[PDB]
């Protein structure tokens, strides 16, 4: 149905996302159990990690377009990422390595992320109708890999340890690289302009020097989140100043602030919603026992099923509004489940968390899939930078918010933790409901501005 390089890109993307989410699903638990962080330290450190992983995505599109070429940067990104995964596996021998290893993943992701999507776009003549379907299959590829990782990585870490789990993440990247190298002939006339000139070693060294610097800067910021906070606060207020000095851009600003709220909520899945499942949900569904950390896999699951369906079925601002109402309902469902539908021992049915993740995933399908695509319809480079900066800030803010659900390591009673989760999830849901209503009210004015 699709060009042959599509299937190569599909499977490179699947395996790279497998590696990434294999780490992400277990990282907060690893912080708590293996490094002895409190839940608060683990949550804010995960927020810092997630912030850097996202903010650095801005680097890989530029490097691929203008410095080394899309295909060269896929190779370099995959190599740095695999090195990062093996470095994380090694951090169990050398605990002092952990932050450097996470910086290597962040920077490696930064170089890699933007480029397979770019490559896929070049596999089709410019107005080919199959483009939309191919990109929906690409998103499904991301989420099949993520589904497998979130399902299996906690089981693997429980049965064989973290060193094995992280080495398998590295192996998944190695197998993405082997499949890419094996299919190189399929994309011989596909690439950005630098792919077809010989590689400039001047630019390659600039990219390696800058990468290593960034790896060390990431390690420092993740170790000292209290200065990551001020770095991003001052960067945010300053870039806000420089956005305000320089009206279709104002729509980009309000949509950016709405996305910030969205990412605050998305950031809870590996932290507060993860530990809520650990502490206050039954670990059995349809009669099978499961690792509650695997509950995170419900997000890609619902995406995998719902992206085709919703592909078959207003315009820009109303889809954002709809997504925000869905996310609000996810957290209100969590709060309601804990408030009214718990056992005498403080535990709630896992079907309530299935529903939380359904709502949350529909919110994702309305918002993050369809955000910067028609933020790109309203707009440049400055707003791309501000976009990534503010969404990284969103992940830091999300870690801070998750700390309101943090449980001391000495608490053992679900009736003590249930009211904490429910108070926080309910207040998140009420604030997000308010935000969705103001979005609804502004939908007509924005939709005029888009004209």
């Amino acid at each position, epitope marked *: 149905q699709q060009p042959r390089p599509f299937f190569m890109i599909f499977f490179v993307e699947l395996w790279e996302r497998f590696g990434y989410y294999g780490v992400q699903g277990v990282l907060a638990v690893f912080f708590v*159990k293996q490094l002895g962080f409190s839940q608060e330290q683990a949550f804010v450190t995960f927020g810092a990690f997630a912030a850097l992983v996202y903010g650095l995505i801005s680097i890989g599109g530029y490097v691929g377009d203008h410095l080394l070429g899309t295909k060269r940067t896929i190779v370099l990104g995959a190599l740095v990422l695999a090195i990062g995964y093996f470095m994380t596996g090694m951090s169990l021998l050398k605990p002092d390595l952990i932050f450097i290893a996470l910086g290597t993943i962040a920077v490696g992701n930064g170089l890699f992320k933007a480029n397979p999507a770019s490559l896929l776009s070049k596999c089709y003549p410019p107005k080919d109708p199959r483009l939309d379907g191919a990109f929906t299959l690409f998103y499904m590829s991301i989420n099949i890999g993520s589904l497998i990782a979130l399902s299996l990585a906690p089981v693997i870490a429980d049965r064989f340890g973290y060193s094995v789990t992280y080495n398998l993440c590295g192996a998944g990247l190695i197998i993405a690289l082997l499949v890419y190298i094996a299919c190189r002939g399929m994309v011989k006339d596909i690439g950005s302009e630098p792919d077809f000139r010989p590689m400039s070693f001047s630019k390659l060294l600039y990219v390696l020097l800058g990468s290593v610097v960034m790896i060390f800067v990431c390690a420092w910021l993740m170790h000292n989140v209290e200065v990551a906070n001020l770095v991003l606060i001052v960067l945010s207020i300053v870039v806000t100043i420089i956005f305000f000095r320089q009206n279709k851009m104002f729509v980009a600003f309000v949509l950016m602030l709405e996305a910030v709220v969205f990412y605050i909520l998305y950031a809870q899945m590996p932290t507060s919603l993860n530990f809520f499942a650990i*502490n206050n949900v039954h670990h059995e569904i349809l009669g099978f026992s499961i690792n509650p950390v695997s509950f995170q896999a419900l997000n890609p699951f619902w995406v995998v099923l719902a992206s085709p369906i919703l592909a078959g079925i207003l315009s820009m601002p109303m889809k954002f509004t709809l997504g925000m109402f869905m996310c609000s309902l996810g957290f209100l469902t969590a709060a309601a489940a804990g408030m009214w539908f718990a056992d005498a*021992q403080g*535990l709630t049915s896992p079907w309530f968390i299935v529903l939380v993740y359904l709502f949350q995933s529909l919110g994702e399908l309305f918002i993050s899939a369809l955000g910067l695509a028609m933020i790109a319809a309203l707009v440049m480079g400055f707003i791309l930078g501000m976009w990534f900066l503010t969404q990284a800030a969103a992940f830091l803010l999300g870690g801070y918010v998750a700390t309101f659900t943090a449980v001391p390591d000495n608490i053992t009673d679900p009736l003590e933790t249930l009211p904490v989760y429910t108070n926080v999830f309910g207040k998140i849901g009420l604030v997000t409901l308010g935000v969705a209503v103001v979005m609804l009210l502004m939908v007509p004015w924005l939709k005029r501005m888009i004209a």
Partner: nanobody, 122 residues
Framework: VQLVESGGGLVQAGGSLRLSCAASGPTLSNYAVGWFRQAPGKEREFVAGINWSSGLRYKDVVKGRFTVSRDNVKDTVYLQMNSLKPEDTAVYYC?????????????????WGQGTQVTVSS
């Protein structure tokens, strides 16, 4: 996923016994281990437990007599039972639940040992 309990037996009132719980493939380290007991003609009741990060929970009638502890090297959990009394006679079970919580009812725990008889004679 399967726990083996050991160390039960017959003891006189005021004596002591130590139960131990070991798991097979999973690392017990990620688990809260609760000890339950079933006396003749009654339901399983929570006795004592330790979560994955050394938090402890006890039934009121065994406090000051029972101690739960964990040897994370041997991947084993222990119940030290001192000042034993006849009404402590029961089948004892260890149960394991992932994480930091020790719920009071058997339905909170997915993995169960087979049970060890403890008898305390007057």
């Amino acid at each position: 996923v399967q726990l083996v309990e050991s160390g039960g037996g017959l003891v006189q009132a005021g004596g002591s016994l130590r139960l131990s719980c070991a798991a097979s493939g999973p690392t017990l380290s990620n688990y809260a281990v609760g000890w339950f007991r079933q006396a003749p003609g009654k339901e399983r009741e929570f006795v004592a437990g330790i979560n994955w990060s050394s938090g402890l929970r006890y039934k009121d009638v065994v406090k000051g007599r029972f101690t739960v502890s964990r040897d994370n090297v041997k991947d084993t959990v222990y119940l030290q039972m001192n000042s034993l009394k006849p009404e402590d006679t029961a089948v004892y079970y260890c149960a394991a639940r992932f994480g930091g919580m020790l719920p009071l009812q058997p339905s909170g725990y997915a993995n169960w040992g087979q049970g060890t008889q403890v008898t305390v004679s007057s």
